[PDB]
């Protein structure tokens, strides 16, 4: 949604642009289009969704 | 200068005419050749314009 996907070399994350302020990427700040064969240079990682550990 | 991807640089202005970017990635080899049959245009244009 804002930001950028950024990896230190063995792990995702999403921070804003203009200041490194890492973040894990949960279904809050992301958002989906489509199925994942049409981008170009697409990756692979786990998008945490934070209701599945509450499990209320 | 701090360096960065050309499609995603396009991606950025994309966004900020508030169409969003999943837009661009979809389309991003008709927007390449809509870009470069303009650029080629244009000399052909400024040659034969008066
Ligand atoms: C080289 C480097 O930055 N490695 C870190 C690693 O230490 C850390 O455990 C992981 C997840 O926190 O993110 C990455
Ligand atoms: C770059 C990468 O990881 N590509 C994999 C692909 O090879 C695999 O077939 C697919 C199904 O899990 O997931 C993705």
Redesign the pocket.
């Given at each position: 949604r804002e930001g950028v996907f950024v990896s230190?070399?063995?792990?995702w994350?999403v921070t804003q642009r203009n200041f490194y302020e890492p973040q894990i990427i949960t279904t809050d700040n992301t958002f989906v289009s489509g199925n994942c064969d049409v981008v170009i240079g697409i990756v692979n990682n786990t998008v945490y969704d934070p209701l599945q550990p509450e499990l209320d | 200068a701090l360096q960065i991807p050309f499609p995603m640089q396009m991606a950025y202005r994309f966004n900020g005419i508030g169409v969003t970017q999943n837009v661009l990635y979809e389309n991003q080899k008709l927007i390449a050749n809509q870009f470069n049959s303009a650029i080629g245009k244009i000399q052909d244009s400024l040659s034969s314009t008066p």
């Open positions: 230190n070399g063995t792990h994350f | -």
